[PDB]
């Protein structure tokens, strides 16, 4: 009954379905997860405190359990790859991605909802995007969808095969299959069953069942998004070695 | 865009996969489907209101469309065939069937579930199937799987060629091929595609892909059957063997049943 | 961890689906199975080496395990029964049979395939089956389907109750129920679940799921049938009709064979 340093960490992408990927894996009894995003390897105020601080945040695990921590930001912070690698160059990493365009929209919707939860002002999406008839390359959200670029920063410290790429779109539509691939990757016993997931009409997404608990734009523009990522995607498919059904 | 009487009707059988059939057929742009079971011909309180009432229950449609409706109870209601015949003797009917035994366990499961969500108790399926050491021939489920006996009633008013039998077992394993046969039968154009379906391992069945959106049938469609002692399943398969043999001869085609 | 003589043997029939029966039974953790066909009791070159040789061919097993061996040729080899009986008159035997006609066709497809994997030529099945207007009783494949004739050789040394007959056709259509009957017969704990089997569209047969593995039988299992003239297939059914009736009588139970 102790606290151990993370056997595995979910590194992103932001708005790729990380909250769910965690919650699902959490179902496995051989898994203990850190309730909240820790932000260790990305925030100086946190990375300075050292690994000891990092462990203070972990949850209480059993010898036969493996600890997990989720922090979406890691994937898009160039300084985090090397650091973690210095903590364990053999550690195993989970990267959940979804259609680049969809991801962008999810991001904006996030930021918008945050500002409005503070009587603070934010521009309409079309405003952060379009700039003189073309895509405003200054929009942070768009950068976070250039998966190819951010991958390189992880391949330089990690082997393609130590970073499992979960299909985000598929996890929304058909969870179980993807969670199975994850169990196998982390070498856990197939303890999760299709029965652990069930679609909820009012929610619009799958929800979970563990023990006895039951818990949960202008088309012409969207097109420009697709056309913009088309190329960058091709590069990604190639860098990782497998395609995805992105527009 | 107006309300029109159905040119086609899914008449059963109960638990044969009527919802799936209705939703997949619904994918066709030239098809307008009633969202719920109407129970027009089989309930006196409804039939007594006349064709007029029936018409107001249909979805609204464009002139070029074919309206569809589904009431699984129709198949085994003796009085229905003649009533549908009076409305339109030329109508084309859809009947989806699957293994007689499978259908029984499927019928049982639903009734069990309905009782549960109503905090009421219901026995295990073997108490209903067997009693005093004998196969209980009074269990309605069994009677609903005697296809030949119910079919004869329909054949008194409609040509076998106007009753397309959908292979429910096959629909479960590979939808498209069966849905294609439905398209030709209803003289609809080849609009539906293989890409309109995809297997879903979390669900355990195929799901649909219309527009770009995705969907699976509700939680009530595709429940898990109960474990039944082989010896019991054996008595079931034997009970339907001869009746199945009459059915194949009557409709001129065999089905891969137990 | 040691090597033990077989507590049970799958004796045949050839092409009745012995590989499938062995692989499925292997899922049970309390079972150790010999990878390949041993051919102990039927080949002099082997039987002459004694039980020590037989033991040396078995796989390693735990005390709480039972060893199984598969040699489809045993069933149709006259000298075998007495020999096995000498080793252990109380041993339990597994016999898997499917429609005699289907079996004959699988047998032919088997020999055809083999010939082509050696550039050697082989005629179409019709050439082998017909001879002067009737079935060619010199075609070995036909003889191997005369279950009654071969069964007598086994009942002369073993009690009917010690020879479990697995329905080959049913194993193909719905495995689990038959595998359950086998477990019970061999007195094993019901450790196999329906979830261990799943139908595979591309394959055309059920496949297995144990632990986290997903596998189907090799390319040699489930080969494409030779399109046969219906009038010929009929002659086959009529040929086995009487012999089947005798078999059903001898073993005390019928099978759905044409
Ligand atoms: N089972 C699930 N329930 C809810 N959202 C899920 C989900 N599986 C995947 N997601 C996706 O995960 C996104 C959230 O990303 P993250 O958790 O990484 O911030 C959601 O986007 P929305 O924000 O548009 O709902 C949704 O698209
Ligand atoms: N794609 C699909 N998804 C869910 N159920 C489907 C389906 N295709 C066929 N079915 C069958 O439809 C049955 C219910 O039929 P109906 O709509 O006529 O009540 C289900 O029985 P189970 O729920 O017993 O498995 C299931 O076998
Ligand atoms: N799940 C399965 N996969 C493949 N073949 C199976 C099977 N279950 C039964 N069989 C049958 O087993 C036969 C082979 O028998 P055996 O292993 O004794 O030689 C195959 O003959 P075919 O290849 O002619 O179809 C096939 O019909």
PDB file of N, CA, C and O in Angstrom, chain B residues 102 173-174 206 228 230-231 233-234 237 241 256-258, chain C residues 170 173-174 176-178 180-181 184 199 201 206 209 256:
ATOM      1  N   UNK B 102     -33.616 -19.448 -31.580  1.00  0.00           N
ATOM      2  CA  UNK B 102     -32.985 -18.180 -31.260  1.00  0.00           C
ATOM      3  C   UNK B 102     -34.068 -17.146 -30.955  1.00  0.00           C
ATOM      4  O   UNK B 102     -33.948 -16.359 -30.012  1.00  0.00           O
ATOM      5  N   UNK B 173     -25.369 -11.158 -39.309  1.00  0.00           N
ATOM      6  CA  UNK B 173     -23.974 -11.372 -39.722  1.00  0.00           C
ATOM      7  C   UNK B 173     -23.429 -10.488 -40.841  1.00  0.00           C
ATOM      8  O   UNK B 173     -22.237 -10.156 -40.843  1.00  0.00           O
ATOM      9  N   UNK B 174     -24.276 -10.131 -41.803  1.00  0.00           N
ATOM     10  CA  UNK B 174     -23.835  -9.290 -42.909  1.00  0.00           C
ATOM     11  C   UNK B 174     -25.053  -8.635 -43.540  1.00  0.00           C
ATOM     12  O   UNK B 174     -25.603  -9.126 -44.519  1.00  0.00           O
ATOM     13  N   UNK B 206     -23.780  -4.785 -36.120  1.00  0.00           N
ATOM     14  CA  UNK B 206     -23.445  -3.751 -37.081  1.00  0.00           C
ATOM     15  C   UNK B 206     -24.200  -2.486 -36.707  1.00  0.00           C
ATOM     16  O   UNK B 206     -25.236  -2.551 -36.046  1.00  0.00           O
ATOM     17  N   UNK B 228     -28.402 -21.829 -21.666  1.00  0.00           N
ATOM     18  CA  UNK B 228     -29.387 -22.901 -21.593  1.00  0.00           C
ATOM     19  C   UNK B 228     -28.708 -24.260 -21.723  1.00  0.00           C
ATOM     20  O   UNK B 228     -27.856 -24.449 -22.592  1.00  0.00           O
ATOM     21  N   UNK B 230     -27.553 -27.620 -22.866  1.00  0.00           N
ATOM     22  CA  UNK B 230     -27.578 -28.244 -24.192  1.00  0.00           C
ATOM     23  C   UNK B 230     -28.754 -29.202 -24.377  1.00  0.00           C
ATOM     24  O   UNK B 230     -29.405 -29.185 -25.413  1.00  0.00           O
ATOM     25  N   UNK B 231     -29.017 -30.034 -23.372  1.00  0.00           N
ATOM     26  CA  UNK B 231     -30.125 -30.979 -23.441  1.00  0.00           C
ATOM     27  C   UNK B 231     -31.439 -30.250 -23.703  1.00  0.00           C
ATOM     28  O   UNK B 231     -32.304 -30.764 -24.406  1.00  0.00           O
ATOM     29  N   UNK B 233     -31.740 -27.120 -25.205  1.00  0.00           N
ATOM     30  CA  UNK B 233     -31.666 -26.581 -26.556  1.00  0.00           C
ATOM     31  C   UNK B 233     -31.965 -27.697 -27.535  1.00  0.00           C
ATOM     32  O   UNK B 233     -32.575 -27.473 -28.577  1.00  0.00           O
ATOM     33  N   UNK B 234     -31.529 -28.905 -27.188  1.00  0.00           N
ATOM     34  CA  UNK B 234     -31.747 -30.070 -28.028  1.00  0.00           C
ATOM     35  C   UNK B 234     -33.243 -30.320 -28.199  1.00  0.00           C
ATOM     36  O   UNK B 234     -33.710 -30.555 -29.312  1.00  0.00           O
ATOM     37  N   UNK B 237     -34.606 -27.568 -30.593  1.00  0.00           N
ATOM     38  CA  UNK B 237     -34.283 -27.780 -31.992  1.00  0.00           C
ATOM     39  C   UNK B 237     -35.123 -28.901 -32.590  1.00  0.00           C
ATOM     40  O   UNK B 237     -35.516 -28.825 -33.758  1.00  0.00           O
ATOM     41  N   UNK B 241     -37.943 -28.836 -35.733  1.00  0.00           N
ATOM     42  CA  UNK B 241     -37.438 -29.501 -36.912  1.00  0.00           C
ATOM     43  C   UNK B 241     -38.496 -29.782 -37.981  1.00  0.00           C
ATOM     44  O   UNK B 241     -38.358 -29.328 -39.123  1.00  0.00           O
ATOM     45  N   UNK B 256     -30.641 -21.831 -42.933  1.00  0.00           N
ATOM     46  CA  UNK B 256     -29.681 -22.587 -42.137  1.00  0.00           C
ATOM     47  C   UNK B 256     -30.027 -22.537 -40.655  1.00  0.00           C
ATOM     48  O   UNK B 256     -29.345 -21.890 -39.864  1.00  0.00           O
ATOM     49  N   UNK B 257     -31.095 -23.228 -40.281  1.00  0.00           N
ATOM     50  CA  UNK B 257     -31.510 -23.245 -38.888  1.00  0.00           C
ATOM     51  C   UNK B 257     -31.116 -24.523 -38.165  1.00  0.00           C
ATOM     52  O   UNK B 257     -30.732 -25.510 -38.792  1.00  0.00           O
ATOM     53  N   UNK B 258     -31.206 -24.496 -36.839  1.00  0.00           N
ATOM     54  CA  UNK B 258     -30.861 -25.647 -36.016  1.00  0.00           C
ATOM     55  C   UNK B 258     -31.825 -26.814 -36.250  1.00  0.00           C
ATOM     56  O   UNK B 258     -32.943 -26.559 -36.758  1.00  0.00           O
TER      57      UNK B 258
ATOM     58  N   UNK C 170     -23.295 -29.895 -36.666  1.00  0.00           N
ATOM     59  CA  UNK C 170     -23.632 -28.931 -35.637  1.00  0.00           C
ATOM     60  C   UNK C 170     -22.403 -28.194 -35.137  1.00  0.00           C
ATOM     61  O   UNK C 170     -22.470 -27.000 -34.854  1.00  0.00           O
ATOM     62  N   UNK C 173     -22.011 -25.349 -37.408  1.00  0.00           N
ATOM     63  CA  UNK C 173     -23.029 -24.324 -37.304  1.00  0.00           C
ATOM     64  C   UNK C 173     -23.083 -23.598 -35.956  1.00  0.00           C
ATOM     65  O   UNK C 173     -23.389 -22.403 -35.915  1.00  0.00           O
ATOM     66  N   UNK C 174     -22.767 -24.303 -34.867  1.00  0.00           N
ATOM     67  CA  UNK C 174     -22.831 -23.720 -33.521  1.00  0.00           C
ATOM     68  C   UNK C 174     -22.019 -24.603 -32.551  1.00  0.00           C
ATOM     69  O   UNK C 174     -22.575 -25.440 -31.844  1.00  0.00           O
ATOM     70  N   UNK C 176     -20.067 -24.181 -29.474  1.00  0.00           N
ATOM     71  CA  UNK C 176     -20.270 -24.192 -28.029  1.00  0.00           C
ATOM     72  C   UNK C 176     -21.151 -25.308 -27.469  1.00  0.00           C
ATOM     73  O   UNK C 176     -20.721 -26.045 -26.594  1.00  0.00           O
ATOM     74  N   UNK C 177     -22.390 -25.450 -27.959  1.00  0.00           N
ATOM     75  CA  UNK C 177     -23.238 -26.520 -27.416  1.00  0.00           C
ATOM     76  C   UNK C 177     -22.599 -27.911 -27.460  1.00  0.00           C
ATOM     77  O   UNK C 177     -22.704 -28.689 -26.498  1.00  0.00           O
ATOM     78  N   UNK C 178     -21.941 -28.222 -28.575  1.00  0.00           N
ATOM     79  CA  UNK C 178     -21.307 -29.527 -28.737  1.00  0.00           C
ATOM     80  C   UNK C 178     -20.069 -29.670 -27.841  1.00  0.00           C
ATOM     81  O   UNK C 178     -19.814 -30.736 -27.278  1.00  0.00           O
ATOM     82  N   UNK C 180     -19.710 -28.269 -25.069  1.00  0.00           N
ATOM     83  CA  UNK C 180     -20.210 -28.423 -23.711  1.00  0.00           C
ATOM     84  C   UNK C 180     -20.487 -29.903 -23.451  1.00  0.00           C
ATOM     85  O   UNK C 180     -20.085 -30.434 -22.419  1.00  0.00           O
ATOM     86  N   UNK C 181     -21.169 -30.565 -24.385  1.00  0.00           N
ATOM     87  CA  UNK C 181     -21.478 -31.982 -24.225  1.00  0.00           C
ATOM     88  C   UNK C 181     -20.196 -32.795 -24.046  1.00  0.00           C
ATOM     89  O   UNK C 181     -20.180 -33.785 -23.312  1.00  0.00           O
ATOM     90  N   UNK C 184     -18.681 -32.272 -20.428  1.00  0.00           N
ATOM     91  CA  UNK C 184     -19.465 -33.096 -19.523  1.00  0.00           C
ATOM     92  C   UNK C 184     -19.102 -34.585 -19.653  1.00  0.00           C
ATOM     93  O   UNK C 184     -18.941 -35.282 -18.646  1.00  0.00           O
ATOM     94  N   UNK C 199     -17.997 -16.189 -35.088  1.00  0.00           N
ATOM     95  CA  UNK C 199     -18.032 -16.448 -36.525  1.00  0.00           C
ATOM     96  C   UNK C 199     -17.193 -15.424 -37.281  1.00  0.00           C
ATOM     97  O   UNK C 199     -17.246 -14.235 -36.975  1.00  0.00           O
ATOM     98  N   UNK C 201     -16.524 -13.918 -40.989  1.00  0.00           N
ATOM     99  CA  UNK C 201     -17.044 -13.773 -42.350  1.00  0.00           C
ATOM    100  C   UNK C 201     -16.075 -14.165 -43.461  1.00  0.00           C
ATOM    101  O   UNK C 201     -16.443 -14.909 -44.363  1.00  0.00           O
ATOM    102  N   UNK C 206     -16.393 -20.707 -37.601  1.00  0.00           N
ATOM    103  CA  UNK C 206     -16.147 -20.115 -36.303  1.00  0.00           C
ATOM    104  C   UNK C 206     -14.645 -20.174 -36.051  1.00  0.00           C
ATOM    105  O   UNK C 206     -13.947 -21.017 -36.614  1.00  0.00           O
ATOM    106  N   UNK C 209     -11.154 -17.675 -29.415  1.00  0.00           N
ATOM    107  CA  UNK C 209     -10.689 -16.562 -28.580  1.00  0.00           C
ATOM    108  C   UNK C 209     -10.328 -17.092 -27.201  1.00  0.00           C
ATOM    109  O   UNK C 209     -11.214 -17.388 -26.400  1.00  0.00           O
ATOM    110  N   UNK C 256     -29.430 -35.233 -38.625  1.00  0.00           N
ATOM    111  CA  UNK C 256     -30.096 -34.597 -39.751  1.00  0.00           C
ATOM    112  C   UNK C 256     -29.221 -34.718 -40.998  1.00  0.00           C
ATOM    113  O   UNK C 256     -28.589 -33.749 -41.417  1.00  0.00           O
TER     114      UNK C 256
END
